[PDB]
Structure formats: C-alpha cells, structure tokens
Design an enzyme around this catalytic site. Structure first.
Site, PDB file in Angstrom:
ATOM      1  N   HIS A  85      -6.492  -7.191  -2.034  1.00  0.00           N
ATOM      2  CA  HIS A  85      -5.716  -6.262  -1.226  1.00  0.00           C
ATOM      3  C   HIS A  85      -5.977  -6.601   0.230  1.00  0.00           C
ATOM      4  O   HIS A  85      -6.886  -6.050   0.838  1.00  0.00           O
ATOM      5  CB  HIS A  85      -6.119  -4.819  -1.501  1.00  0.00           C
ATOM      6  CG  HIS A  85      -6.014  -4.416  -2.936  1.00  0.00           C
ATOM      7  ND1 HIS A  85      -4.833  -4.459  -3.639  1.00  0.00           N
ATOM      8  CD2 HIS A  85      -6.953  -3.955  -3.793  1.00  0.00           C
ATOM      9  CE1 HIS A  85      -5.046  -4.032  -4.874  1.00  0.00           C
ATOM     10  NE2 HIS A  85      -6.322  -3.723  -4.991  1.00  0.00           N
ATOM     11  N   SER A 122       0.827  -1.171   0.000  1.00  0.00           N
ATOM     12  CA  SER A 122       0.000   0.000   0.000  1.00  0.00           C
ATOM     13  C   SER A 122       0.890   1.260   0.000  1.00  0.00           C
ATOM     14  O   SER A 122       1.629   1.439  -0.957  1.00  0.00           O
ATOM     15  CB  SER A 122      -1.007  -0.143   1.165  1.00  0.00           C
ATOM     16  OG  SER A 122      -2.040   0.858   1.007  1.00  0.00           O
ATOM     17  N   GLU A 176      -9.809   0.951  -7.034  1.00  0.00           N
ATOM     18  CA  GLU A 176      -9.006  -0.250  -7.225  1.00  0.00           C
ATOM     19  C   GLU A 176      -8.710  -0.510  -8.699  1.00  0.00           C
ATOM     20  O   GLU A 176      -7.618  -0.969  -9.042  1.00  0.00           O
ATOM     21  CB  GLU A 176      -9.692  -1.449  -6.575  1.00  0.00           C
ATOM     22  CG  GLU A 176      -9.393  -1.518  -5.072  1.00  0.00           C
ATOM     23  CD  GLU A 176     -10.428  -2.296  -4.307  1.00  0.00           C
ATOM     24  OE1 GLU A 176     -11.338  -2.871  -4.944  1.00  0.00           O
ATOM     25  OE2 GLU A 176     -10.343  -2.317  -3.068  1.00  0.00           O
TER      26      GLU A 176
END
Length: 276
Positions: A254, A124, A222
């Site tokens: 994720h 991330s 996303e």
C-alpha cells in the site's frame, strides 16, 4: 516525478453545488479521460498523484486526457447530507455532483473532453468511490479501478472505522456524510452491495490490494482489507461478473510506488476499453 514541460494546466472549475471553485490539474491528450482520485488526506494545493508519482508523464501521448481534481479531504468524493458537524466546515461537500455533472460539463465545453467513455481510478478512500461512480454513471465510466480500496463500507465495523479515519484526517464527521450506519446512504455507496450494477453494465473493473505498507494492529487492518477485496472478487464472480482484473500480489504494498505501478499497468487496459 513527471518531467517538466508537460502540458499540465491548473484550472478553476466552479461548483455551483458547493458554492466555490474547485482547482483541477489537467493534461489534455484525447476526448476520453482518466479521472485520478486522491486519498483520505487530499490536499488543496496538488492532487496526491502529482505529488507522489509521474502519472502525467506516464500518460502523456497515451491518447487519453488526465484529470486530477484537487481537494476534498475525507470527502469520499460523495455528496454529503450536511456540512461536517464539528470542524467548522461552512458548506456541504457535493463531490459526486461535481465529478459527474459540473466538472465534465466544464471540460466538454472548454476542452472538448467527452462526458462519456472515461475511466475513474481511485486509491484508499477513493477506491470504493471509483467503483461507485461507475456503478451509478456507467456511460460516464465504462472503466473503474480501485487501488487498496475499502469495498464493503456499510458492513460490520467499517462505518465506525471510516468515522475514525475521517476524524483523524481534518476532523470530518462520517455522520454528516452518510448519516448513522443504518442510513440507506451507507448501502447506496457500498461497492459490494452495488456489484449487480457493475455486472449489469459490464463495467471493466481493475481491483488491486497489497498485503501491507512498506513499513500488529496495522497488520490486522491490512489483513481485513485484503479479505474484503477477496470477498469482493468472489461476490463479483458469483453475481455473474466477467470483466474484472484482480491483482493481489503477495509482495504488493500500500504505497504510492505500487499504486503508480498499477496505474502504469492498467494503461493498456484503459486504452483498449476506452479507445478500442
């Protein structure tokens, strides 16, 4: 998740540049190390990799040391221009200086970990950070992995989106970090922009991006994030890159379980690159 009894130490590593001690979770197991960087909501007690995954157990007796720095909420593991202007931060984040000078010096002198020939692994927030660390410090990091990273932070809306995320995570201010979006710091720290460094240095890069979180605006975000990762792959190839692994499984998520699966999957790759 890691079974009890592993040789994990909790170290106090002074940062002269930040004027404070940085806590580091450390498992020794060889002269070369995997640096496991946390996400946007990094806590001051434990690194998210230890909270959410069996990373230490998975790399026990791998022939690699494991380094989990603790802290740095919304820091992007970078050196900031100034203290975050709004949330009362009373010092300047200097996490690039910490990771590339202060911490490796400490671990070399006290543990015998080599300051050269290591891997940087981020997710991330820190996916891009890992790539930037290898881009500018290739002797320290011949290996870098980005898991669900944001790899074109200077482009279009991304500086604003990053600013929004940083404000949500502890009220940090992106302007204090890298200045306005026109500031050279945004391009300096943009993995897409720094692809020629990654190519020239023949960095081994491992880039993962999932297709969603296990749980519509998120779906747009996303999709955009995946597209940036695919563009990064395409640009890396176009610029002559030949040393990458690009993992975009359509059912990838994720999530800490999938980021852990990637950490396990890359272990053999890191072993071959760092330990031959």
């Amino acid at each position: 998740f890691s079974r009890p009894g592993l040789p994990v130490e909790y170290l106090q590593v002074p940062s002269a540049s930040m004027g404070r001690d940085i806590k580091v979770q450390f498992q020794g197991g060889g002269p070369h190390a995997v640096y496991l960087l946390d996400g946007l909501r990094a806590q001051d007690d434990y690194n998210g990799w230890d909270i959410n995954t069996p990373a230490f157990e998975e790399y026990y007796q791998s022939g690699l040391s494991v380094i989990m720095p603790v802290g740095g909420q919304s820091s992007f593991y970078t050196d900031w221009y100034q203290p975050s202007q709004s949330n009362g931060q009373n010092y300047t984040y200097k996490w690039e200086t910490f990771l590339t000078r202060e911490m490796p010096a400490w671990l070399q002198a006290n543990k015998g970990v080599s300051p050269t020939g290591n891997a940087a692994v981020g997710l991330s927030m820190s996916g891009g950070s890992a790539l930037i660390l290898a881009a500018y410090y290739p002797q320290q990091f011949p290996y870098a992995a980005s898991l669900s990273g944001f790899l074109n932070p200077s482009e279009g809306w991304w500086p604003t989106l990053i600013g929004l995320a940083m404000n949500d995570s502890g009220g940090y201010n992106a302007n204090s970090m890298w200045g306005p979006s026109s500031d050279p710091a945004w391009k300096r720290n943009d993995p897409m922009v720094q692809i020629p460094r990654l190519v020239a240095n023949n960095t081994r890069i491992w880039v993962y991006c999932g297709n969603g979180t296990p749980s519509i605006p998120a779906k747009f975000l996303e999709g955009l994030t995946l597209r940036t990762n695919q563009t990064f792959r395409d640009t890396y190839a176009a610029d002559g890159g030949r040393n990458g692994v690009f993992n975009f499984p359509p059912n990838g998520t994720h999530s800490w379980p999938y980021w852990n699966e990637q950490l396990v999957a890359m272990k053999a790759d890191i072993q071959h690159v760092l330990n031959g």
